[PDB]
Design a protein around this motif. Structure first.
Motif, short mmCIF file in Angstrom:
data_model
loop_
_atom_site.label_atom_id
_atom_site.label_comp_id
_atom_site.label_asym_id
_atom_site.label_seq_id
_atom_site.Cartn_x
_atom_site.Cartn_y
_atom_site.Cartn_z
N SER A 31 0.79 -1.24 0.07
CA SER A 31 0.21 -0.13 -0.14
C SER A 31 0.89 1.25 -0.02
N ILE A 32 0.27 2.49 -0.34
CA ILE A 32 1.08 3.67 -0.24
C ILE A 32 1.64 3.83 1.05
N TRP A 33 1.25 3.37 2.31
CA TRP A 33 2.03 3.42 3.37
C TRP A 33 3.03 2.71 3.57
N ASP A 34 3.11 1.25 3.19
CA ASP A 34 4.51 0.59 3.15
C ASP A 34 5.46 1.30 2.25
N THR A 35 5.06 1.92 1.14
CA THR A 35 6.21 2.77 0.44
C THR A 35 6.36 3.93 1.32
N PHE A 36 5.58 4.54 1.87
CA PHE A 36 5.96 5.77 2.66
C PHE A 36 6.69 5.62 3.75
N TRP A 119 -6.96 4.04 4.45
CA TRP A 119 -5.77 4.81 3.89
C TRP A 119 -4.77 3.72 3.32
N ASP A 120 -4.85 2.59 3.28
CA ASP A 120 -3.97 1.58 2.78
C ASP A 120 -4.18 1.52 1.17
N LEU A 121 -4.23 2.42 0.55
CA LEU A 121 -4.43 2.44 -1.00
C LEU A 121 -3.42 1.48 -1.57
N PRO A 122 -3.73 0.49 -2.38
CA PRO A 122 -2.77 -0.35 -3.04
C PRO A 122 -1.99 0.70 -3.92
N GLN A 123 -0.68 0.18 -3.82
CA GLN A 123 0.41 0.96 -4.81
C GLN A 123 0.20 0.94 -6.13
N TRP A 124 -0.29 -0.08 -6.79
CA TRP A 124 -0.82 -0.04 -8.08
C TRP A 124 -1.62 1.24 -8.32
N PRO A 179 0.24 9.79 0.21
CA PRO A 179 1.63 9.69 -0.22
C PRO A 179 2.57 10.91 -0.19
N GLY A 180 2.21 12.12 0.77
CA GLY A 180 3.01 13.05 1.07
C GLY A 180 3.25 14.16 0.08
N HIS A 181 2.28 14.57 -0.60
CA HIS A 181 2.30 15.76 -1.45
C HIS A 181 1.93 16.88 -0.81
N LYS A 182 2.44 18.03 -1.33
CA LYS A 182 2.32 19.38 -0.72
C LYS A 182 1.70 20.50 -1.63
N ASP A 183 0.51 20.14 -2.02
CA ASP A 183 0.02 21.14 -3.27
C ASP A 183 -1.48 21.15 -2.67
N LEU A 184 -2.10 22.49 -2.42
CA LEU A 184 -3.42 22.57 -2.02
C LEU A 184 -4.39 22.34 -2.97
N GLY A 185 -4.22 22.51 -4.35
CA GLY A 185 -5.11 22.00 -5.46
C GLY A 185 -5.19 20.61 -5.55
N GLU A 186 -4.28 19.93 -5.19
CA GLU A 186 -4.32 18.40 -5.41
C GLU A 186 -5.24 17.88 -4.09
N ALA A 187 -5.04 18.45 -2.74
CA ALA A 187 -5.59 18.09 -1.72
C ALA A 187 -7.23 18.30 -2.03
N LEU A 188 -7.72 19.23 -2.74
CA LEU A 188 -8.89 19.80 -2.94
C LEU A 188 -9.63 18.91 -3.92
N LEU A 189 -8.93 18.37 -4.95
CA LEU A 189 -9.34 17.44 -5.94
C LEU A 189 -9.66 15.99 -5.18
N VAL A 190 -8.56 15.61 -4.45
CA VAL A 190 -8.48 14.34 -3.71
C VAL A 190 -9.85 14.16 -2.78
N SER A 191 -10.09 15.31 -2.11
CA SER A 191 -11.31 15.09 -1.33
C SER A 191 -12.43 15.03 -1.87
N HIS A 192 -12.73 15.72 -3.18
CA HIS A 192 -13.70 15.43 -3.99
C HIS A 192 -13.73 14.07 -4.47
N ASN A 193 -12.59 13.44 -4.86
CA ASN A 193 -12.84 12.06 -5.34
C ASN A 193 -13.01 11.20 -4.36
N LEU A 194 -12.64 11.37 -3.02
CA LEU A 194 -12.87 10.68 -2.07
C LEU A 194 -14.29 10.64 -1.80
#
Ligand code: NA
Ligand code: NA
Ligand code: NA
Ligand code: NA
Length: 444
Positions: A31-36, A119-124, A179-194
């Motif tokens: 998952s993204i947390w194994d990677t992180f 939160w354990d999104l598959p890495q694929w 995954p540890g990004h730092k971009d407000l726009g990305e976070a807003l889009l992520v919240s919508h797709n969630l």
């Protein structure tokens, strides 16, 4: 005369990556947390969930231990990378673990509450864009559909997402979580797709029309206080309140994003993901709302990196997380939901608990009296919510056991059960014995 009815559900909670271990067993992929956790510096002391509490192997002991405490419900999460370790590739051995876990729970009179995504999104999935890719709505939907089909006759209470604020803003804007990004726009889009992915699961869930089965979502919520009565600190409080609470409560329960925050965010990033058809999917009727409460926030005007609001320390006692102990906000949030958002819809406290510096005594005891007092104070506010007409159906303590506390690693212990990671031995803390007695007496 009971303060908690015989129908009330006293529960405890865990999450898959925090307790299971067996991180590459029986077909599980990263998952993204194994990677992180393997990115230098992203998890404290390079800790990871390779082994964690080894709950994957010790689950029968753990369920027996919960039976012996009187636990009436158990909130856990299902690991997406176990079920679909590659895109479009179902893994029956992964499903088998959650069937034998569920069977042990039912045989022990414990009602299962299953979190679909914790939160354990598959890495694929992340390699294809993850929550930034709108197609994740379909991948999540197929994942959810598979769980409902294979487990829906035995799990009757379903949570789509745990704390989307963490998976969006904390993961893509602040960057503390995978995954540890730092971009407000990305976070807003992520919240919508969630939220849209949550709506796809609800739509699928309603179509199956399973008997006696309920679906909801879990939100971590706080109460925001201005540091002073000034107009500037009040504006800062509105920003923090919209950031944490209203940005998710309004689309789910009002069918629209909070307009002040749409305008505010829109000065700094794109907000063009908003449309009527998406919000209709997002605002589908739920059977319950799960509330995760830990602390309040006191905020003053300023900008120190995030938005135009700076959180300050008011000077009162804090847990080992650095979180103020403030039980009254549990009542305030629950009443705010009743008055403005959820009305008479059933509510669950799906997480509440505290981290303290627990030590095992020479006689094998853990005298975690601070956690006992913490839980007493918060169960009293839940009791007061019920007395004032609130529709609280249950209370899940975080956590059943000490576990992997994400970016803190194993340095923070939340359990009512102590875990010695060297031996994986479980030790009942005094908070566990106190909770056992509360379940038996149901008065506080
Ligand atoms: Na793990
Ligand atoms: Na690591
Ligand atoms: Na969970
Ligand atoms: Na609803």
């Amino acid at each position: 005369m009971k303060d908690f009815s015989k129908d009330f559900l006293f529960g405890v909670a865990t999450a898959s990556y925090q307790v299971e271990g067996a991180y590459n067993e029986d077909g599980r992929t990263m998952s993204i947390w194994d990677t992180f956790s393997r990115q230098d510096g992203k998890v404290y002391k390079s800790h990871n969930g390779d082994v964690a509490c080894d709950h994957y192997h010790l689950y029968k002991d753990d369920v027996k231990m919960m039976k012996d405490l009187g636990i009436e419900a158990y909130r856990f999460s299902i690991a997406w990378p176990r079920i679909f370790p590659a895109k479009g590739q179902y893994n029956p051995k992964g499903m088998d673990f959650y069937k034998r876990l569920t069977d042990e729970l039912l045989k022990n009179d414990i009602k299962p509450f299953a979190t679909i995504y914790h939160w354990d999104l598959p890495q694929w999935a992340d390699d294809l864009g993850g929550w930034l890719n709108r197609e994740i709505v379909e991948w999540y939907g197929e994942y959810a559909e598979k769980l409902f089909s294979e487990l829906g006759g035995y799990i009757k209470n379903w949570i789509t997402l745990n704390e989307p604020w963490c998976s969006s803003f904390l993961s893509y804007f602040i960057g503390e979580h995978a995954p540890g990004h730092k971009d407000l726009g990305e976070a807003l889009l992520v919240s919508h797709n969630l939220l849209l992915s949550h709506g796809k699961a609800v739509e699928i869930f309603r179509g199956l029309n399973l008997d006696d089965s309920k679906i909801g979502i879990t939100l971590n919520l706080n109460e925001v206080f201005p540091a002073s009565d000034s107009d500037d600190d009040k504006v800062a409080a509105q920003i923090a309140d919209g950031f944490q609470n209203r940005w998710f409560l309004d689309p789910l329960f009002k069918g629209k994003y909070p307009q002040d925050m749409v305008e505010y965010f829109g000065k700094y990033a794109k907000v063009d993901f908003i449309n009527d058809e998406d919000l209709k999917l997002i605002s589908q009727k739920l059977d319950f709302l799960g509330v995760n409460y830990y602390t309040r926030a006191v905020v003053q005007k300023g900008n120190d990196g995030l938005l135009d609001a700076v959180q300050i320390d008011p000077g009162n006692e804090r847990t080992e997380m650095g979180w103020e102990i403030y039980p009254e906000s549990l009542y305030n949030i629950l009443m705010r939901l009743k008055r403005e958002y959820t009305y008479d819809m059933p509510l669950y406290i799906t997480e509440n608990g505290a981290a303290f510096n627990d030590v095992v005594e020479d006689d094998g005891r853990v005298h975690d009296e601070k956690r006992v007092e913490f839980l007493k104070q918060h169960f009293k506010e839940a009791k007061r919510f019920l007395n004032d007409g609130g529709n609280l159906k249950g209370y899940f303590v975080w956590s059943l056991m000490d576990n992997f506390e994400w970016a803190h690693g194993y340095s923070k212990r939340f359990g009512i059960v102590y875990v010695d990671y060297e031996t994986e031995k479980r030790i009942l803390k005094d908070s566990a014995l106190w909770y056992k007695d509360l379940i038996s007496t149901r008065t506080i």
